[PDB]
């Protein structure tokens, strides 16, 4: 009660809707079903999957009689976003795409016979993720590869989002020697997906848990690379929980730390505290007859499960985007030069 972070109302556990005024897309319920019951995403996997259902749901237009297609879809698509907000609040990978999409709703005129409404939207929103994601990730590949020598180590955290493809390129598409250290944490064992993949790729993978983190650093170790969820306007890395403890330690143990990221994952907002702006996710998950049951109904017990947390930018040495590399204090200068400009 003294910190009262349990009464930080960033999320509730509300469910069970029945309303049928909107024609709810059945497949967008599947997307929310695939998130909230068991999380299967990073952030750019959402930015793919949020786009996967959007190409389908615009194809079923269902434009009514006395309404322009500019007038209904700004309500029709945005009503379906609140289904996701019941499941999981948005990211900036969510956020920067959808406001760009709401521009495209507004910049059309009453001239389209709804047959032309596909290809002016379809390839355009396809060339979004073709440019802003795919070949944006291509420029990640050449930039990080020249900053990695052979016969070294990489320490990652959680499931990566883009540097999985980077580790595939340096182990197979360039065949230089490399050892991989993947560490994830209870409850979301998403780093095991990388641990399956890179040894299916056939490379030296050492799996790890965050409680045993010191003895990884007591060996020959360097080049700590990180996934990301958003970068603050200061330089704080808003990312998956438990990122900063290796980010403080490897910076304390004088070997450099980088964050693989992109310009789409920037943001205008700013903060400097970990427990201010976050999300909780269903406190039943940290249980597994069990050992304990009854965080409810029992006096003086609670289960927290932090999803996102900030890292100080002094821990990060170099921030790499698709345009290049940059020091972490110099993050917000792209916000005036490329994001909404490029």
């Amino acid at each position: 009660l003294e910190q009262s972070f349990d009464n930080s109302s960033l999320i509730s556990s509300v469910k069970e809707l029945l309303l049928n005024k909107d024609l709810i897309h059945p497949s967008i319920l599947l997307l929310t079903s695939h998130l909230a019951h068991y999380k299967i995403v990073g952030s750019i996997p959402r930015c793919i999957a949020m786009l996967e259902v959007f190409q389908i749901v615009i194809k079923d237009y269902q434009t009514p009689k006395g309404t322009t297609l500019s007038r209904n879809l700004t309500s029709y698509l945005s009503h379906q976003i609140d289904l996701l907000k019941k499941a999981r609040p948005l990211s900036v990978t969510m956020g920067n795409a959808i406001r760009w999409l709401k521009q495209e709703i507004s910049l059309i005129d009453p001239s389209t016979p709804d047959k032309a409404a596909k290809k002016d939207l379809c390839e355009k929103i396809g060339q979004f993720a073709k440019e802003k994601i795919e070949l944006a990730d291509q420029l990640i590949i050449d930039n990080a590869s020249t900053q990695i020598e052979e016969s070294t180590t990489i320490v990652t955290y959680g499931s990566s989002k883009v540097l999985t493809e980077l580790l595939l390129h340096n182990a197979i598409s360039l065949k230089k020697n490399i050892k991989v250290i993947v560490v994830d944490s209870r409850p979301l064992f998403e780093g095991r997906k990388m641990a399956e993949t890179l040894r299916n790729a056939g490379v030296n993978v050492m799996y790890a848990l965050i409680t045993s983190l010191d003895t990884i650093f007591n060996m020959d170790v360097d080049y700590v690379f990180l996934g990301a969820h958003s970068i603050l306007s200061n330089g704080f890395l808003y990312s998956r929980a438990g990122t900063a403890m290796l980010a403080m330690s490897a910076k304390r143990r004088n070997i450099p730390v980088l964050v693989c990221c992109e310009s789409l994952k920037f943001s205008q907002r700013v903060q400097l505290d970990s427990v201010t702006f976050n999300e909780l996710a269903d406190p039943n998950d940290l249980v597994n007859k069990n050992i304990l049951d009854g965080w409810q109904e029992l006096p003086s017990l609670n289960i927290v499960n932090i999803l996102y947390d900030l890292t100080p930018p002094e821990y990060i040495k170099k921030v790499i985007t698709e345009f290049g590399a940059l020091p972490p204090s110099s993050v917000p200068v792209i916000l005036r030069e490329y994001k909404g400009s490029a």
Binding site: N204, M206, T215, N218, M219
Partner: protein, 410 residues
């Protein structure tokens, strides 16, 4: 309850290890710088036993002198130790009936066939067996086995398929699964007349065989007059359940963690690395019990004793184990392999996935891959190897000898 008898039998897999085994039994062979007699013996020292009964159908003279040099002939061991000599080719079960004709064994007792290695407790196995006593008087035994979950078809020699009960876990029938690389003999058969009082029953494959069964003394007397059974599970667990004897209930048991038994070198390939890793928790290598070793643990699974001369610029990779009396040289590479005690390593040799035993001298520029070397077998210069070289004991190798796959030379 009390008086935990047992019976230990080696000497059934002399067919399996024929390039070796001419001078010493399979059970005498070193897994990780130390043999696998005492892996079982310390495991039934965990059982809290009072006596054992060895079977040595071959190489009988070089068994007890090793026990004379063990701690087990010295009076603080959990059991007194007894041996039984025998002539050759005395198969399983016929070792029992002649012992049953002797008839020392009273009550409950421990079958360990093959050579096993595990981490399972003795406790939860046994009241489960006593739960069978409290549920049945026509009971037979409880066969504890593990669950090779992510890997079917890599239990190398024989694939074993089991059908058992949901509730009581009574093993319904056994039929040996064929070779999985052989896509031809695609049929199993289970006669449903004996499927009366189960009606919800589990048919599995991944129960990896370890032959660790405990049973009462009545069922060898049942096994006595049925003298036409020659194996443990290939014939007898079928015929005791295929309606010939009426109302006899054998159970199995499944555990969620490690228990295994050596079948071939491919089993010797896998579980050596599993024991060298932390997959054998808690029975770990730095315990140093048997020849009261001096192994100190380091990260990435390094098992170094003392008196280890590590040269400059020789990288030691993951999953290695080094005894005393050893000297590596400059420019060599040590990775994912055990190293015998008291040996010599030359210059620029890449040992990789190969189990070199004691007293071995390797000539320079002679890399070794998937090729274990037995005792006293030195090498020469430019001796290149490949998969399956199971070269044997005291084998002099001259220079420049490259070999082919499955070189079972001696």
């Amino acid at each position: 309850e009390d008086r935990l008898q047992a019976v230990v039998l080696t000497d059934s897999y002399e067919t399996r290890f024929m390039p070796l085994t001419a001078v010493k039994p399979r059970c005498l062979l070193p897994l990780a710088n130390v043999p696998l007699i005492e892996y079982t013996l310390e495991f039934l020292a965990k059982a809290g036993v009072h006596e054992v009964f060895l079977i040595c159908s071959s190489h009988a003279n070089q068994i007890n002198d090793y026990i004379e040099n063990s701690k087990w002939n010295l009076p603080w061991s959990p059991f007194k130790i007894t041996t039984i000599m025998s002539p050759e080719a005395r198969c399983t079960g016929d070792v029992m009936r002649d012992l049953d004709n002797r008839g020392i064994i009273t009550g409950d007792f421990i079958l360990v066939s093959g050579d096993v290695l595990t981490n399972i407790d003795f406790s939860k196995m046994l009241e489960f067996h006593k739960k069978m006593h409290l549920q049945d008087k026509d009971h037979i035994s409880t066969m504890c086995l593990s669950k090779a979950s992510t890997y079917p078809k890599t239990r190398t020699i024989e694939p074993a398929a089991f059908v058992l009960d949901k509730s009581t876990s009574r093993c319904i029938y056994y039929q040996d699964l064929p070779l999985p690389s052989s896509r031809e003999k695609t049929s199993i058969q289970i006669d449903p007349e004996l499927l009366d009082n189960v009606d919800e029953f589990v048919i599995r494959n991944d129960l990896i065989d370890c032959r660790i069964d405990i049973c009462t003394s009545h069922v060898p007397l049942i096994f006595q007059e049925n003298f036409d059974y020659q194996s443990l599970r290939t014939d007898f667990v079928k015929g005791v359940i295929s309606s010939d004897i009426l109302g006899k209930h054998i159970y199995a048991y499944l555990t969620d963690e490690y228990a295994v038994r050596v079948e071939s070198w491919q089993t010797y390939d896998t579980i050596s690395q599993d024991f060298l890793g932390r997959w054998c928790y808690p029975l770990v290598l730095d315990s140093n019990i048997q020849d009261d070793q001096t192994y100190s643990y380091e990260s990435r699974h390094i098992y170094k004793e003392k008196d280890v001369v590590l040269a400059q610029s020789c990288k030691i990779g993951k999953c290695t184990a080094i005894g005393s009396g050893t000297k590596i040289g400059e420019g060599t590479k040590i990775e994912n392999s055990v190293i015998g005690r008291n040996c010599q390593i030359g210059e620029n040799i890449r040992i990789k996935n190969s189990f070199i035993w004691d007293d071995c001298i390797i000539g320079n520029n002679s890399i070794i891959d998937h090729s274990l070397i037995a005792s006293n077998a030195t090498l020469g210069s430019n001796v290149r190897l490949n998969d399956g070289c199971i070269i044997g004991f005291n084998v002099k190798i001259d220079d420049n000898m490259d070999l082919d796959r499955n070189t079972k030379i001696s």
